[PDB]
Amino acid sequence: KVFGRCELAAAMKRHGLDNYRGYSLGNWVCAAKFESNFNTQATNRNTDGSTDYGILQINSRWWCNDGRTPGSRNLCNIPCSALLSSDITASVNCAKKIVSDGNGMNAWVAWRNRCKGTDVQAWIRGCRL
Ligand SMILES: [Pt+4]
Ligand SMILES: [Pt+4]
Ligand SMILES: [Pt+4]
Ligand SMILES: [Pt+4]
């Protein structure tokens, strides 16, 4: 599913991401825009053989099992395919574990490079939340 900007803001808010570990909603919507362009079905292969999955491009080296990342750790305890669903629940629950890991949202390279220190509130502007 390809989310609309405000539709996704609303789903993320409902799933408890607004201010989760201090990151306002706008940060999460900005990260999703640049990671996956709001498409829950996005996949991208990394040079090391791992793959990134879903709206927040969560990586198979650490976070999920895809059966093809030798020495992967499956920290979210979830097949990576579960992260491609139109229901964002699995992605959201896994993202919560990731952002708690010590590096905050810096774990998402597009967030660091494209959202960090920008006016992220613009991403939720005009939405009914
Ligand atoms: Pt569809
Ligand atoms: Pt939902
Ligand atoms: Pt909804
Ligand atoms: Pt594996």
Q: Report domain extents, the chain.
A: 1-129
Collapsing DSSP to helix, strand or coil, 39 comes out as strand
Q: Say how far apart CA 35 and CA 88 lie, in whole Å.
A: 15
- Look up the CATH number of domain 1-129: 1.10.530.10
- Phi, psi at residue 107, to the nearest 5°? -55, -25
For residue 58, with 0-12 CB atoms within 10 Å meaning exposed, 13-18 middle and 19 or more buried, which class applies? buried
- Residue 21 vs residues 31, 41, 97, 125: alpha-carbon distances, Å: 15, 26, 10, 21
The experimental method is X-ray
Calculate how far, in angstroms, residue 80's C-alpha sits from the geometric centre of ligand 1.
Answer: 19
Q: Please, where are the H alpha helices in 15-116?
A: 25-36, 89-99, 109-114
Residue from 7, 18, 35, 119 carrying the catalytic annotation: 35
Q: Binding site annotation covers 48?
A: no
Residue type, 58: I
Residue keyed to tokens 């669903």:
85
Our answer to whether residue 52 is catalytic in this structure is yes
Resolution in A, one decimal? 2.0
